[PDB]
Amino acid sequence: MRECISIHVGQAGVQIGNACWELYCLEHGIQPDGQMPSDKTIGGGDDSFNTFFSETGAGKHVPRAVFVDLEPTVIDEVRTGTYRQLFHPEQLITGKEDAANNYARGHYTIGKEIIDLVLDRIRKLADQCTGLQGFLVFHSFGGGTGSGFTSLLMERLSVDYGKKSKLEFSIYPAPQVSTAVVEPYNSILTTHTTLEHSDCAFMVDNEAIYDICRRNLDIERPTYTNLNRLISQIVSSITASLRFDGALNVDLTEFQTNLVPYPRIHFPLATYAPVISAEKAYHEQLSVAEITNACFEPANQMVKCDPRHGKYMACCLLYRGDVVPKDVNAAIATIKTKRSIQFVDWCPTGFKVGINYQPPTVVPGGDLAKVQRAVCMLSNTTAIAEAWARLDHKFDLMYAKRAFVHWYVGEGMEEGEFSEAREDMAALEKDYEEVGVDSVE
C-alpha cells in the first residue's frame, strides 16, 4: 500500500496542513468527524484513502500525519476548530515556548526536547505502513520551528530510514514582503539540510501568490487562508496518481527520476494553470492546449521569478480529469516549437506527462470554480537562482556588521556556522551557473 507521511512543522506548516487535510477529506469523501458516509459501499483503498488515512476499526479514518509545534498555540486552533475529532490525539504534539524566530533555539535548545517524542510518533506510523513511500515535510524557511526544528528532524529521518523520498514544501522568503527582520539569518542556516537531506525541495513565496489571487482570480484581499487552498491543489495533484487510477501514473519516485538531473539540483518550482474566478470561468476555452500554455507563463509562477531569465531543465505535467492524451502531445509539440521557452541543450527530450482521471475538488468556501482539467507543472529551471541572489544579498548586508549575532551564539551555535552555510549556498548558486551552460567542442 502506497502510504505516505505528512509532517507539519511550525506555524506555517500547521496552517497549510489545515488546508491540505481539509481537502483530502473532500477527495475521499470523509466527514470532519473522520467518517465516510453511508453512500460508500465501494472500494476504499480502491479510491485509496489508504495512503493518507489509516482506517481505524468501525469505519474511521485517521491520517498518517503528525502536527508538530514548539508553541502550544497553533495546534490549539485545531483543538477545537472543526477538525477536533478528525485528528488522533497523539499526533498533535506541542512544546511550551516556540523557537521564537531563532534557528539556534529550534535546532539545539528547544528542538531536542521534543525530537525524540516526535521520532517516536513517526515509528508508530512507520510500523503501521506496508509499502511506505516517503515523507512530506511542510514548513517555512524563516521561522524558528520551520527552520531550526526541520533541520533537526531531517537529520534524524535520514539516519533511521535513508531509502524513502522526503519531499519538502517550503515557503521561501519574499524579496519585499517580510515580517521578521532576522528572516535571512534563518534561511541561510536551513540551507544545510535542505540540499543535503531532502530529496526534492519545493519553494513558494507569498508575493508570487498574491499576484495570482489578485490578477487571475480577482480576489481583492487575500489572507494566508486563501493562499494555502492554492498550495494544497498543487500538492493534491502531486500525490494524486499514487492514489487514483489514470493512464501514465506517476509515483513519488517517478518525479525524482524524471525531474532531477543531478544530486543537488532538486529545487523545482510548481505551477498550476486553471486559477479561474467563477465569472471568468465562462469565457473559458479551458482545453488542454490552453492550460498547457498557461503553465509556461512567467506570470502564473508560484515563485517570484521569470523563466525568461533562465533555461528550463525538465518539466513535468500532472493532469487531472477529462483528458485525451493526443491533445497533450500536440500541446507539447507547440511548446517545443516556441523559442521564448529555452530548454537546455542537454535535455533534449523535454518532459514527462502524467495524467489522472480524478478531477479536483472545489474546496467549499474556496476561491476556485468548478474546472474539468488541471495541471501542475513541476519544472526545474535555472531561474530559481535569481530568488537566491536576492536573499544572499540581504544576508550579506546584515552579517557584514554581525547584527543579530549575540542572540544566536548564546543559544547553542557558533559564529563559524554562518560562514559555512553562506559558502554552502554560494556553491548552489554556482551549480546553477554551470548547469545552465551547454558544453561545446
Add this chain to the structure above:
Amino acid sequence: MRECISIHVGQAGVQIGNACWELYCLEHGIQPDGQMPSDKTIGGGDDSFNTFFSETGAGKHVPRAVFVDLEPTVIDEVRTGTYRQLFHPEQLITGKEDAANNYARGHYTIGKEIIDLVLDRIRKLADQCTGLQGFLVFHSFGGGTGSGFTSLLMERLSVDYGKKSKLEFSIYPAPQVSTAVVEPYNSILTTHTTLEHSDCAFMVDNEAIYDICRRNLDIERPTYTNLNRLISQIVSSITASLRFDGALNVDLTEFQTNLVPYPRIHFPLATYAPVISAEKAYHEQLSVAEITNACFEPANQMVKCDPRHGKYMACCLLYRGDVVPKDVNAAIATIKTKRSIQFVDWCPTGFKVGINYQPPTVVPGGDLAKVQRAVCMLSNTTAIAEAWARLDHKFDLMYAKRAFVHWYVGEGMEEGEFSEAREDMAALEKDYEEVGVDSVE
C-alpha cells in the same frame, strides 16, 4: 474385520481427534448423535465403518477411540460441544492436574495413576476386535501428556500386544514458533519411545502448515482448528484403503513394508497435493499428472524442510477418487526423469502406488473445496535430519547451563537421563548421514 484403535493424548492429541472424528462421521454418513440416517439400507461394514465404529445395537455407532488427558478441561470441551453423545462415556478419561509441560510428571508422577485405567479401556476395545490392525496414537512432542504419558503408554502397549502396527501422529517443535520454553526438554525425552516402540512416527509442525494455508489456500489467519482439518485428510487417506474398495489397496502393514528400509528409519513425512481454495479450484487442471508433481514440491511439505537438501528413500502414493492408473505410471516416469529429485542409489525402484475409489469429503465449514482426486505422499527422505539439527541445538543450548533441571529432577527422573536421550537422538541423526550415502566399490 480390519479394526483399528485411535488413542488421543494430551491437549493437541484431543483437539486433532475432534477434527478426525468429525471427518469419519462424514465419511461413513453418521450424524453427530452416532446414527446412520434412514437412506442407508446398504452394506455398513461394506462401506466399512467397522474399522472405526463398533456398531452398538439399535443402529448406533461408537468409535474404537480413547480420549485421554491428565487435565479435565480439554475433554470437557467434548462434553458438551456437539460430540457429547457421539462418544461412549467411558472412553473419556480425565485426570485432575495435567503434567504441566513436564515430562517427569507425565511419565512417572501423574501418568502412572491413570495408566492402568487407560490400558484397561484398551482391553475393552481389544477384546471387541476380531482382526485388530494396530493403534493410532495422536499427541505432540513438547506437551507433558503428549510426551510423558505417550512414552509411558507405548511401553505398555509393546508388552501387551507386540505384533500390531503402532502409528504415531506427532507434532514436531517448530524452529521459530514455540510457546513453552522447555519445549526442547520434552522432545529429547520422548525420543526414546518414538524410535524404539512406535513402528512409524509421523512428524508435522505448525509453520509448514501456516505456509500452506496462507499460500495455497489464501486463508488470512489460521487457528489450530484450521490446521487439524488438514491433518485429518492425511490420516483419512492413509487408512482409507483398509475400509474402502479400490485397485491396489494398502493395508496398514503395507506401508511399513514398502516405506521403511531399516529398523529406525521410520520417520516419513506426509504431503497432500490438492490444497485448493474454492475460487482457485476453477482454474484447475487437477489431473493426476499435476497432483503427482505437487507432491514433490518442497513448498507443499508438511515439515519445515526442503527435500532439495536430502535424498528421498521411498515414496508412497495414496490416491483417492476418479483415477486411471496408467496416468499415474506416466507421471511416475516423469518423476524418475527429473534430476532435481534425488532418490538414493540403492532404492532403485522408486515407489508404491495405491489407489482408492472413495473421494474425500469436504468438511462442512472446512477450508478445502470439492476435489476429484487427492494424494498423500508418505515419503522417507534424509531431509528430516535437518528438522533434528535445528532442535538439538536448542536443547544443547539450554542444557549447557542446566537451566530447567530443578523442575525435572524433583518429579521422578534423573540428571543422567538427559545425557542418554541426547546420545540417543544424536545416533539417529548419524543414521541418516550414513543412509543418504551410496556405497561404491
Add this chain to the structure above:
Amino acid sequence: MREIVHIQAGQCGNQIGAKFWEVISDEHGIDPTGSYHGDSDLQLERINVYYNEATGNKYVPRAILVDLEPGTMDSVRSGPFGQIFRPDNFVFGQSGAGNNWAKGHYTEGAELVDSVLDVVRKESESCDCLQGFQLTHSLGGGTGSGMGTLLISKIREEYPDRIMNTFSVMPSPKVSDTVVEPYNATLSVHQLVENTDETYCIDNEALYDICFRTLKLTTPTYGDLNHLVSATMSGVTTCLRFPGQLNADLRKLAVNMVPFPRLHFFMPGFAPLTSRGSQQYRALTVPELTQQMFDSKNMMAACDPRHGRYLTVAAIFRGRMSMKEVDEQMLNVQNKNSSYFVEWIPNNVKTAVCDIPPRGLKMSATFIGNSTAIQELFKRISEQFTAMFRRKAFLHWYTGEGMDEMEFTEAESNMNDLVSEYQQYQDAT
C-alpha cells in the same frame, strides 16, 4: 500442439494484452466468465494454442501478467476480463519500477523473477508440444524494458529453441512523455539483439497517424492505439489457429524474414483501415488491400520505407480469397518498385493466406516488413542518448541501483553497431 505462452510485462504490456485477450477471446467465442459460446467448430480445434481448457469447459489462457506495481493488476481483475485469467498468474510486487531500467533489471526484478519462472514452468510443463513465447512490453518503461529483458535472458537458459518474439513499443522524438526514455531504451535494445527471434517494433506517432489520417478518428487514447496493435498480433499467428491455403506459423515467418541473425526487427502493417461511413465507398478487394500495405501511411513504425529498402516482407491474408490475385499483386509490386527492394534477394515477399477473416469484415491482410529504414529509429534514440550521456545526466539513479558506466558505453555501441548492419544491407549491391 504449438502452444504460445504469453508474458505481458509492465504497465503498457498489460494494457495491450488486456485488449489482446479481448480480441482473441472474441476469435474463439470465449465468454467474459470463461465459458465457450461459439457455433463453428473451427474455434475449438485450435483453441489450445492460447487456452488451457479447465474443468467443465472453462477456458483459461496461457498468459502470465508481470508487474512491479499492484495497480494494473487490480484494474484488470476488477474490469470485464478479470474473470478470465488464473489468479495465480497475477504476479506482482509492491514497490514501483521508477521508469528506471536498473530498478526493474537488478534490484527489484531479480527478487521477483524466481516467483515468475516458477509460473512459466507451470505453463510449460502442461503443454503438449510448445512452440513459442511472446512478450508484450515497452522499450522506455521500467518493467517493460528492464524486467522484460531479465525474463527473456532467463528463458533462453531454459527453453533455448522456442520462437521468442516481442511486440515492443519504441520511443519517438515527436511524442515524449518520460525524460530518460533514451537511457531505458538503450539498455534494452542491447538485450533484444542477442536474445530474441523476432521483434515487432511499434511506435506511438505511427499509431496516431493511422488514427488521424486513415481511420479518421478524433481523439485517440492508449485504449485506441493498442486496439489496432492487437489486431496485428492476432494476424501473426492466424494460420497457427485457423486452417488456411498457405500456412505460416511463427517459425515459418522467422525463417524467411531474417537474412542474417541479429536483424530481426520488423515493421508491421495492417489493412484495411477505413472510417465508418467510408466503408461503403471503398470496394474491398486484393488490389485495394495491397496498395495500403505498400503505403507508408499504414506503417505502425514511424518511418518511411522510402528511406531504405525492404530486405524481406511477409503478407498474411485472412479471407476467402484467390491465389492468382494474391500471386499477381505481390508480383506487380516488386516489379514496379524494384528499387525499393533489396535486389540480392529474389522474391522478397512471402504470402500466406488464411481462410478466416476478423469478426466484422472480409479480406483483411497483414504486412510484416524487414526494411532497412528502421535504422531511422535507432539513430534518433542514439542522438538523444549521446546528448544526455555526455553530461552524465540522471546518472545517480542508475549507478545507485547496481549498474555502472561500462554497461552504458557498451550498450550504446551495440545499438550503434546495428545501425551499421542495416546500413550495410541497404546499399553495397
